[PDB]
Design a protein around this ligand. Structure first.
Ligand SMILES: *[C@@H]1O[C@H](CO)[C@@H](O[C@@H]2O[C@H](CO)[C@@H](O[C@@H]3O[C@H](CO[C@H]4O[C@H](CO)[C@@H](O)[C@H](O)[C@@H]4O)[C@@H](O)[C@H](O[C@@H]4O[C@H](CO)[C@@H](O)[C@H](O)[C@@H]4O[C@H]4O[C@H](CO)[C@@H](O)[C@H](O)[C@@H]4O[C@@H]4O[C@H](CO)[C@@H](O)[C@H](O)[C@@H]4O)[C@@H]3O)[C@H](O)[C@H]2NC(C)=O)[C@H](O)[C@H]1NC(C)=O
Ligand SMILES: *[C@@H]1O[C@H](CO)[C@@H](O[C@@H]2O[C@H](CO)[C@@H](O[C@@H]3O[C@H](CO[C@H]4O[C@H](CO)[C@@H](O)[C@H](O)[C@@H]4O)[C@@H](O)[C@H](O[C@H]4O[C@H](CO)[C@@H](O)[C@H](O)[C@@H]4O[C@H]4O[C@H](CO)[C@@H](O)[C@H](O)[C@@H]4O)[C@@H]3O)[C@H](O)[C@H]2NC(C)=O)[C@H](O)[C@H]1NC(C)=O
Ligand SMILES: *[C@@H]1O[C@H](CO[C@H]2O[C@@H](C)[C@@H](O)[C@@H](O)[C@@H]2O)[C@@H](O[C@@H]2O[C@H](CO)[C@@H](O[C@@H]3O[C@H](CO[C@@H]4O[C@H](CO)[C@@H](O)[C@H](O[C@H]5O[C@H](CO)[C@@H](O)[C@H](O)[C@@H]5O)[C@@H]4O)[C@@H](O)[C@H](O)[C@@H]3O)[C@H](O)[C@H]2NC(C)=O)[C@H](O)[C@H]1NC(C)=O
Ligand SMILES: *[C@@H]1O[C@H](CO[C@H]2O[C@@H](C)[C@@H](O)[C@@H](O)[C@@H]2O)[C@@H](O[C@@H]2O[C@H](CO)[C@@H](O[C@@H]3O[C@H](CO[C@H]4O[C@H](CO)[C@@H](O)[C@H](O)[C@@H]4O)[C@@H](O)[C@H](O[C@H]4O[C@H](CO)[C@@H](O)[C@H](O)[C@@H]4O)[C@@H]3O)[C@H](O)[C@H]2NC(C)=O)[C@H](O)[C@H]1NC(C)=O
Ligand SMILES: *[C@H]1O[C@H](CO[C@H]2O[C@@H](C)[C@@H](O)[C@@H](O)[C@@H]2O)[C@@H](O[C@@H]2O[C@H](CO)[C@@H](O[C@@H]3O[C@H](CO)[C@@H](O)[C@H](O[C@@H]4O[C@H](CO)[C@@H](O)[C@H](O)[C@@H]4O)[C@@H]3O)[C@H](O)[C@H]2NC(C)=O)[C@H](O)[C@H]1NC(C)=O
Ligand SMILES: *[C@@H]1O[C@H](CO)[C@@H](O[C@@H]2O[C@H](CO)[C@@H](O[C@@H]3O[C@H](CO[C@H]4O[C@H](CO)[C@@H](O)[C@H](O)[C@@H]4O)[C@@H](O)[C@H](O)[C@@H]3O)[C@H](O)[C@H]2NC(C)=O)[C@H](O)[C@H]1NC(C)=O
Ligand SMILES: *[C@@H]1O[C@H](CO[C@H]2O[C@@H](C)[C@@H](O)[C@@H](O)[C@@H]2O)[C@@H](O[C@@H]2O[C@H](CO)[C@@H](O[C@@H]3O[C@H](CO)[C@@H](O)[C@H](O)[C@@H]3O)[C@H](O)[C@H]2NC(C)=O)[C@H](O)[C@H]1NC(C)=O
Ligand SMILES: *[C@@H]1O[C@H](CO[C@H]2O[C@@H](C)[C@@H](O)[C@@H](O)[C@@H]2O)[C@@H](O[C@@H]2O[C@H](CO)[C@@H](O[C@H]3O[C@H](CO)[C@@H](O)[C@H](O)[C@@H]3O)[C@H](O)[C@H]2NC(C)=O)[C@H](O)[C@H]1NC(C)=O
Ligand SMILES: *[C@H]1O[C@H](CO[C@H]2O[C@@H](C)[C@@H](O)[C@@H](O)[C@@H]2O)[C@@H](O[C@@H]2O[C@H](CO)[C@@H](O)[C@H](O)[C@H]2NC(C)=O)[C@H](O)[C@H]1NC(C)=O
Ligand SMILES: *[C@H]1O[C@H](CO)[C@@H](O[C@@H]2O[C@H](CO)[C@@H](O)[C@H](O)[C@H]2NC(C)=O)[C@H](O)[C@H]1NC(C)=O
Ligand SMILES: *[C@@H]1O[C@H](CO)[C@@H](O)[C@H](O)[C@H]1NC(C)=O
Ligand SMILES: *[C@@H]1O[C@H](CO)[C@@H](O)[C@H](O)[C@H]1NC(C)=O
Length: 304
């Protein structure tokens, strides 16, 4: 009934890619499904070099949400990532996600969001993904047509990130200095920084830029450097038809609504996919989705 192994391969690629693609490509294949016609079958996957279809039944009132799909983890700690000599495992299934709230930047409710800024990290050496977590104040809330709001010391909290991100690379090998800046896609040049947000069903898109202006160095100065008085909101324009970040493509969905909705959200789980591959590379990113939602409570998702 539940047969599975722990054996995930890593390489290069991106377009035909790997599990990562199959995960989302089909995760939304799932999210089209809640109800509609008068019939029977569709699939389930990830496991043993064969694939499952999950056939459903009914005729032609409360329901949970996912017609078939589920999730489950191991145990024994907070979280690390990999090289795990595993043991115990658990139950779980229901998935109502769309109904609630999300982002592509900062995972929501904190859960013992401790002063000690946490750089929780699933290693894969050079090419990998992280998760920072600080107590400090940050608050994120969106309004109507598509413009979002904030509170908290994001400059300093960012410095914390910056102050939290220096002490792990211990003297790599030489006498140095470090310049930090940001990019996302692979194989083509855009120039823009897009976060998403979910609360109340609508998959609302954001042209977040002023927020993401930051250039970063080891030991700096700003007296004779430049000063202007800029401030912030979010020029979000909802894209139900989903123009895509990591590749200029498209998606869509089927949500209810509450007319005069004003999206609100709790903060903390600031993320990145740092690219420090040999040479002059220390590349922050920002593409971490649905899989992280539960990868947020557990430590690491396992669906199937
Ligand atoms: C969904 O959940 C959300 C959870 O976050 C919730 O939103 C949050 O609610 C709270 C309470 O309403 C918010 O507080 C408010 O937020 C404003 C945020 O704007 C700040 O941050 C931005 C980013 O940096 C920036 O754009 C702005 O510059 C700004 O800093 C606040 O402005 C505001 O705080 C108070 O402002 C008034 C007006 O002066 C004061 O009465 C009050 O005390 C706060 O600020 C003062 O107080 C401190 C110390 O208390 C002072 O040092 C400071 O100078 C200032 O005035 C002073 O008053 C004190 C006396 O008390 C004293 O020191 C001096 O005499 C001085 O004059 C505001 O209340 C929270 O920020 C917000 N989150 C977001 C997002 O903004 C949300 O509502 C919820 N949805 C629902 C269901 O409603
Ligand atoms: C990845 O890519 C980056 C960017 O290309 C690269 O960074 C470059 O590093 C080199 C290291 O050689 C830098 O060269 C140095 O530049 C400084 C001054 O520039 C900096 O400071 C000013 C002011 O703050 C800034 O405006 C500017 O942006 C820079 O940050 C020079 O002063 C250095 O010269 C000293 O060292 C030389 C040896 O290379 C000596 O020959 C020279 O004499 C200087 O020191 C001497 O002075 C003493 C007297 O004061 C004397 O007594 C001693 O004898 C002593 O020798 C230095 O040439 C270069 O600027 C960086 N690039 C850019 C574009 O700015 C990274 O290195 C790279 N990373 C990897 C891993 O490849
Ligand atoms: C991380 O960010 C840093 C800053 O990022 C800014 O730039 C963009 C990338 C945007 O994102 C923007 O929003 C950011 O604010 C990067 O540091 C610098 O990045 C910039 C831009 O990429 C580089 O700037 C260069 O400037 C060149 C100017 O060339 C002139 O050449 C003339 C002929 O030689 C020369 O005369 C002239 O003037 C000189 O002379 C006077 C008088 O003697 C002297 O005082 C001057 O200093 C001059 O030497 C000019 O020098 C331009 O031609 C280039 O095309 C280029 O754009 C710059 O290389 C880089 N500097 C540093 C600090 O290395 C950082 O690279 C980013 N890092 C990463 C990894 O992305
Ligand atoms: C899988 O395992 C994780 C930890 O690894 C495990 O290591 C081996 C040895 C295993 O055999 C396990 O025993 C051990 O769990 C789990 O993470 C931890 O899980 C527990 C329970 O799931 C969490 O405790 C819960 O949260 C509250 C925190 O308090 C804790 O600390 C104090 C002091 O030690 C104790 O008083 C508590 O017992 C906790 O240990 C706590 O308030 C909760 O108690 C409430 O709930 C009960 C039951 O409903 C209720 O009756 C009572 O009145 C309380 O209101 C609760 O026990 C622990 O905090 C958590 N740690 C982390 C990592 O956050 C993981 O949960 C587990 N299963 C999963 C979900 O995969
Ligand atoms: C992951 O983080 C948790 C969260 O705890 C944090 O809570 C906040 C409030 C801060 O205080 C922060 O510092 C703290 O880490 C860690 O959970 C605690 O860890 C301590 C020690 O690491 C635990 O105390 C243990 O109690 C057992 C009883 O069975 C005792 O035997 C332990 O001694 C050994 O610990 C070794 C590793 O620490 C282990 O290899 C040995 O086998 C041996 O068991 C130890 O004294 C305590 O239970 C936890 N308390 C709380 C508040 O959760 C956790 O350690 C972090 N994970 C790792 C891998 O470090
Ligand atoms: C993370 O961010 C990085 C930058 O923000 C990204 O790396 C950059 O990727 C682009 C696209 O491939 C490269 O751009 C090319 O650069 C070369 C270099 O020519 C220069 O050097 C020679 C010799 O020194 C000199 O003669 C020239 O004058 C130039 O100064 C150009 O030839 C190309 O036209 C093209 O612009 C960058 O090289 C590269 N930066 C680095 C590391 O050098 C990175 O892709 C981002 N990663 C992710 C995952 O998003
Ligand atoms: C960042 O969050 C903290 C949390 O406090 C908030 O808690 C929630 C539940 C809500 O009710 C909201 O109103 C609270 O502000 C805030 O920082 C702390 O705020 C309290 C007062 O609200 C401070 O206590 C006071 O401290 C001063 C100086 O010591 C004294 O004058 C008072 O007597 C009283 O003790 C406390 O110091 C603040 N410090 C901490 C621990 O963070 C803060 O409002 C919030 N920042 C924002 C707006 O983003
Ligand atoms: C990022 O990873 C690369 C290489 O990735 C390696 O990962 C392991 C898990 C295997 O998959 C292996 O096949 C693969 O090559 C790193 O390259 C390694 O860098 C090491 C540190 O510089 C380096 O070790 C030292 O020893 C050699 C002599 O053996 C010496 O010349 C070096 O100066 C160095 O001190 C090693 O040479 C090199 N690869 C190997 C195994 O030969 C890369 O450094 C990692 N970089 C970052 C920035 O994370
Ligand atoms: C929460 O606790 C931190 C403790 O930070 C210390 O431990 C690690 C997180 C590590 O990064 C280490 O460098 C750091 O010292 C408090 O930061 C404190 O700031 C004061 C400034 O006077 C100093 O005493 C210390 O540098 C530092 N730690 C200690 C010992 O407290 C932080 O301010 C505190 N804040 C809250 C809200 O709980
Ligand atoms: C690379 O730069 C570092 C910068 O610290 C040099 O380290 C210094 O080494 C000298 C001797 O070469 C020592 O006296 C100092 O203690 C070090 N720096 C200081 C001032 O604390 C290192 O020497 C350089 N590498 C070389 C020249 O190969
Ligand atoms: C991968 O999983 C298979 C079972 O599907 C297992 O036999 C094998 O040991 C794993 N390969 C490794 C070691 O990565
Ligand atoms: C595949 O999953 C479906 C869920 O509907 C189940 O009916 C079927 O038994 C599964 N097939 C196998 C043997 O994996």
């Amino acid at each position: 009934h539940m047969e599975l192994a722990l054996n995930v391969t890593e390489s290069f690629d991106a377009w035909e890619n790997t599990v990562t693609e199959q995960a989302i490509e089909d995760v939304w294949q799932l999210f089209e499904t809640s109800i509609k016609p008068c019939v029977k079958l569709s699939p389930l996957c990830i496991g043993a070099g064969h694939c499952n279809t999950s056939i459903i039944q009914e005729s032609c009132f409360r329901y949970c949400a996912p017609p078939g799909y589920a999730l489950l983890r191991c145990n024994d700690t907070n979280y690390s990532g990999f090289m795990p000599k595993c043991s115990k495992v658990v139950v779980s299934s229901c998935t109502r996600m769309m109904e609630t709230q999300t982002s592509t930047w900062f995972g929501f409710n904190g859960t013992r969001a401790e002063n000690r800024t946490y750089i929780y990290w699933h290693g894969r050496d050079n090419r990998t993904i992280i998760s920072l977590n600080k107590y400090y104040n940050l608050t994120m809330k969106c309004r109507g047509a598509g413009w979002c709001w904030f509170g908290g010391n994001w400059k300093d909290a960012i410095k914390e990130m910056k102050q939290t991100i220096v002490k792990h690379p211990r003297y790599t090998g030489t006498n140095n200095t470090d310049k930090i800046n940001l990019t996302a896609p692979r194989g083509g040049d855009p120039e823009v920084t897009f976060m998403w947000t979910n609360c109340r069903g609508e998959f609302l898109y954001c042209k977040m830029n002023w927020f993401l202006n930051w250039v970063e160095d080891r030991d700096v100065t700003n007296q004779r450097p430049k000063e202007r008085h800029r401030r912030n909101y979010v020029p979000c324009h909802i894209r139900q038809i989903i123009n895509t970040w990591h590749k200029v493509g498209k998606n869509v969905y089927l949500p209810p609504r509450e007319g005069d909705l004003t999206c609100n959200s709790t903060v903390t789980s600031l993320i990145a996919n740092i690219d420090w591959t040999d040479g002059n590379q220390t590349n922050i990113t920002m593409s971490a989705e649905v899989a992280e939602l539960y990868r947020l409570e557990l430590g690491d998702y396992k669906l199937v």
